Symmetry: D2
Subunit: 318 residues, 4 copies
Amino acid sequence: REDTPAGSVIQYSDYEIDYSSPFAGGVAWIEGEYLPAEDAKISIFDTGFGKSDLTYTVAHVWHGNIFRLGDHLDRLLDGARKLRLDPGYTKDELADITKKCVMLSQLRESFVNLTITRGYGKRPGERDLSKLTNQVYIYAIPYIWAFPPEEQIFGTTAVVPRHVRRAGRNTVDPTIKNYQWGDLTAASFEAKDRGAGTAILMDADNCVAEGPGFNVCIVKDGKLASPSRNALPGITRKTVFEIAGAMGIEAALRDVTSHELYDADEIMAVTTAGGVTPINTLDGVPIGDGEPGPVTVAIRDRFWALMDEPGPLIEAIQ
Amino acid sequence: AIREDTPAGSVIQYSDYEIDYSSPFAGGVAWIEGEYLPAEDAKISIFDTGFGKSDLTYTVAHVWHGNIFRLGDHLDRLLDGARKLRLDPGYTKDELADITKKCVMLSQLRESFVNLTITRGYGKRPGERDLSKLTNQVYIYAIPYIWAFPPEEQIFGTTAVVPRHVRRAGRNTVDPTIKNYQWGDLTAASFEAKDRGAGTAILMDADNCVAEGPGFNVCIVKDGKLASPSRNALPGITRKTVFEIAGAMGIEAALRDVTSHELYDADEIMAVTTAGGVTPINTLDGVPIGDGEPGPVTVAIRDRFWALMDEPGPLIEAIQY
Amino acid sequence: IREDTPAGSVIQYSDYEIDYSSPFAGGVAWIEGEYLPAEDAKISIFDTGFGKSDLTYTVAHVWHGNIFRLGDHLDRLLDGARKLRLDPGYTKDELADITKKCVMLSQLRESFVNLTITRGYGKRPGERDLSKLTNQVYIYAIPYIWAFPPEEQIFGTTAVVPRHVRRAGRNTVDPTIKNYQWGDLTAASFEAKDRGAGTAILMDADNCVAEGPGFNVCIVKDGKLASPSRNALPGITRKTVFEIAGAMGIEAALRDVTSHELYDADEIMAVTTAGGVTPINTLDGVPIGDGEPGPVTVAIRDRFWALMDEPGPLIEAIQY
Amino acid sequence: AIREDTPAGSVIQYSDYEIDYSSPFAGGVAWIEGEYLPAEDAKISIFDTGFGKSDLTYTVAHVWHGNIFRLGDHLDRLLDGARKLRLDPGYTKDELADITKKCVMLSQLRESFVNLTITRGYGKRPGERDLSKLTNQVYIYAIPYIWAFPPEEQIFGTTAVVPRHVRRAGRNTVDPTIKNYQWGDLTAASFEAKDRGAGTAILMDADNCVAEGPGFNVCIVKDGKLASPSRNALPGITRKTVFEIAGAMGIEAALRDVTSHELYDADEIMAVTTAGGVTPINTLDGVPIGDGEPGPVTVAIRDRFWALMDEPGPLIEAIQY
C-alpha cells in the first residue's frame, strides 16, 4: 500500500501478509512454474523481446476483488488470435492460474498481467515463426498507479506533444494492447520536460488517439466522447460508458478532433492502473475551473464503489 | 547447427572447422548482468522495461570467417541512439568492444550473429514507476549466423510486395532511425508478404516514400545511379558499406526520398542488412525488375561486400580464438 | 441534350423538345446577380475562389424535371460556408428560388446544378486582407453529367486502389467540406486510367477507405452495408442509400472501413449526385462476388431511380 | 495604388516614376484567350476545370525597379510542373517570356506581381468530362507588387505559430512540389495564425518535419548553417537564390528534413518567397528566436537579395517600357 487522500473513495485494505511464504508480496507464473516475482526471468531469445511479438492485458484487484477478468481474457484472446498467437490454454484455465497467482501473492490490491509471446524455438535466433512455441507469462504484484492517488482525487495536468504522434492502426496497431511504447515513451518524456503530469497524443489526422497507458474521454455540453480509431478498446472506458448510460449521460465512441480536445468542458484519463483521473489543465490552460469536473467526479466515485459490489467482480479466496 | 548450405562456387561460403564442445560456451554465448553464460541458459528479468515497454535500443554485427565487421561503426550507432533515448550503458565503447569479442571468442563461432542491447532495465522492486530509479542493463550475445534471406536467395534473388494494409511507423512515432524491437508494423508486413506468396515486403511511409523492409534497408538502381531512403529508415551499416562500394566503382549513390513511382520504375531493387548482406529483389508485386533476375549493379556490389570479409583492413578485426 | 441509356433500364431521359428561341435554352448561369446563357458565364480571374480555391459548393441533379433534395444540399452548402467563414449574403429560400429559375430558364428536365460560394475579390486585384473581399455566389444548371456512363450504372465499372496517391486528411484539405481542390482526386483518376480501370478508391493516412474522385464508397459484407465516417464528404446520395437500406431492413453504418474490409467486401458501390449508385465489379482486377453488380447494390440503385418519379418530400418539380 | 510606405533608408525602396493613365492597361494587365485586357476586365469561363477541379499549375515572378527576376527559372519550373500534370501550354518558353514581358510593359509598373497560370481548361460543352477533349488555357497578369509580409515586417520581422489543428498536404495527396491554387490547408493555417494574434503559420508534415508556410518556404539557421525542408515544400526560386547567396558568403546550406525539434531550437527562422523576398521570424509560439530581432544571416541574405534587383547580370532583365 501507499498514502491515499483521507476519506476519499480510494482506500487500500487493512491486513498483514504472512512472509513465511516466499510467494508473499508478488508471484509470477512462467514456463508452467509459480515463482516469487523477484525470481521471474524469461529467455532473452523469446521473440516477445527481439520483436515485441506479443499482446497482453492488465487487470486490477481491489479489496481482494479482481475486476472484469472475463472481459480481460476475451480481449487478450481476441488480440492473440489477430496476431496468430496460441496460448495453448483455455480461458477458464488462464482465469485459474491468474486467480492462483493473486492468492499466492496474498495481495488484496494487485496489478496483474497476462502476456502471450511468439516465444522461442529449439535454437536461439530461430526465424521460422512456425517453429516458435508461444509462451504465456502471468504475474501479480502490488497495485501500480499511472497517476498517484492524490491526482486520482485532485487531478493531474496534460500537454499535447509538439514532437510525437500515436502510431496509426496500419503501423504499430494500438487497437491490440502491446509493449511497443516508442511513441508513448517519447510523449511521456515531452510531458516531464514541460513539467506536466502526462501527454494526450493525436493521430495523423489531428484526432485524439490516447495517452501513455490510458484512454481519453472528454465532456462537452453534458455529453461524453472517446476516440474510436487510434486507441485501445479499454475496459475502464467500457466501464465508464456503462456508468454514463446508468446516469443517463450520452456516451459516444467517435473521432474527437484537436479542436474538440482544447474546447472540452472536462477531460479524463481512464485506465486499469488507477481508474479515472481528472485532467485539470491542458497546455497550461485550465479546463473549466481547473478542478476535477462534475461528470468525471460522478463516474470516478461510481467506478471505485463498483469494487465492493458483488456483481462483475469475483473475491479471490485468500 | 553452425553451418547451412550455400550455392556451390558462390561468394558465400561458411568456414570449414570443428568446435570443441567440452567448453559449455561452444556454439553460443550471452553476457547478462555482468556474467558470461551459455546462450541457452540466458534469461532476463520479466520486469526489465526493455520487455514491458520495449524501452531499449540495440545493434547487430556479423562475424564471417572469424572477422567481426565494422564493430566501431556499430558501437558508435548504438551509443548515439542510447544517448537520444537517455539510456546510459555504464561501459565505454572500448569496454563493450572487448566484451562483444570475448562472446564470439568463447562461442568458437567463425560465422556469428552478434547482438548488443541497452534496456532502461528495472528498479529495486518489480514495476518501479520512476525512470530515474530504473538501472539500465546491457545484454550481448553471439549465436550462429542468422539470414534475413537464405543463402540461395542472396545469389538467385527474392521477391517483394508493397503491403496493401501496412506502413512503416514514422520518425515522430516509434522512430525507425533508432534500431528497436518494436516490430509490430514489420511483423504485419511480413505476414502480408507470406500470405501473398512473396519473399518480403517493402514498407512505404506516410507520404508514399519508401521507408525500409522488415530487418533491412532498400536501395534502388535507376539509369546506373543508386538511391536509398533518408527519412523513415535505419541508417544501416550495410547501406553505408554499399554506398562506399558504389563510390569506389564510380556509381553515384544518394540518400534522398525514393517516391513510390521510383520504387515501381526501378531498374534494380536490393535489400541490405548485417544478417546476410545484399539480397537482389527480382520482382515487385509480381512484375519483374529488369529481367526478373538479379541486377548487374546488385551482383557486383554483393560480390564485393563478401570479398570485404577476407581482406585485411580497417572494416574487419580477426577474433583471437 | 440526352444520352443513350440501356433499353428497359431504370435510367431513361425525358422525351421533350427545348425551345431554342430563348437564349437561356440548354444551359443557364447566375453570376453577379445576372442570369446568362451558360456559354457567356465568366468570373473575375481575381476571385480568390480561383487563385486560392477558397470556396465551397454543392451539386444537385434534376431528373424528369424534378430537383432532388435541394433543402439538404442548401443545408450542407451553408453549413460548410459558415465553417469557411464565407457569407453568401442570400437566405436558403432565396438561393432555392434562384437555383429553380436557372433550371426553368435552361428548360433542361435532366440537369447538373452547381451552387458555388467563393471568398471573392476586393476593389483591387491582389487585395490581401480577407476582410476586404466580397464573397461571390455563382449558380449554373447545365445538361446532366455522369461520374460513370449510364452503361456502367447498369452493368458496373472497375476500380483500383492507387499505388501513388492517398486522400487529403481532414486536418489538411478537409474532404468533409465539398471543395474544388482535386489534386489527389485528379492524380488518383490518372493512375486508374493508366491501369485501365474505371476509377480509383483512395485510402486515408491509416489505410481506412476515404472516398473516390467525386463519390462516396459503400461496401456490403454478410448482407450489412458500411461507408467511411472520417475522410469523406457527408454525401446526400450516401444519405439516400442509408434511408433506402433502412426501409429494406439492411443494417448500414457510418464507420471506419479498413483496407482489409474493402478487399474482402461481398459488394462495392460508388454513390454520387452525378449518376447515383454505380456497382464496382472488380478491384485491382479481382472479381468482387461473381464480378457482376451485387444484389444489394442493384436493389438500392433501382430504388434510388424510382425516387425521382414518386411524388414526395425528396423531389420538387421545376415549374417550366 | 502602385507604391506603399517602406522603412526610410531600408534596402526596400519603390521606384519614383509617373504612370500615363491614357493607357487602359496602366496599373494592371491580363492576357486571357490570346487578348491583352485591363486587369479590372480580366474574366475566365466559370467552366474552366482550373476552377471546378483547380486542375492547373502556375508561377509568380516579381518586377523590381523595372527588372523582372529569374524569368527563365520561373518558366522552367512552370513548364516542368505542367508536363508532370499532362498540361500543354501550347506556347514555347520564349513565347511565354515575350508575352509576360509585354504584360509588364503595358502595365507601366516598375514594381509588379506577375502570374502565369496553365489550366486544363474547358471543351465545346460546359462540363466536358473527357480530359482529352479539354483545351489547356494560359492566363498571364501583371498587377502592383503584392507583399506576403508588409515592408515593415521585411525589415523588423514578423511572428509565427505552428498550427494546433492543421498540417500541410503531403506530396502523395495535393502535392506541394507543384505550385498550385489548392490552399485548403494553408488558408486554415492563416486563419489559426490570425485567431492566435500571430504574423503567420509554419506547417508540419505527417512526420513532424517542417513543410512550409502559406505562400513561402521556411529556412532555419543553426550553429551558423542554413537548412530548408527538402520534401513537402515548393522548390522555391527565392529559396534557390538564398542558397546561392549563402554559398557566396561561405555559409553551408542544405535541402533536408527539419524536424519539429530543429524548428523550435533554431537560432534564426526566415520566410522566403517571390512576393516580398526574405522576412525574419522574430518569435515562434511567443518564444523569441535568438534575441527576438532579425538574425545576422537573415539580415545579410535579405540585404544581398534586394541588391540583386539592381546589379546587371543573368538573374535580372530590364523591361523596355
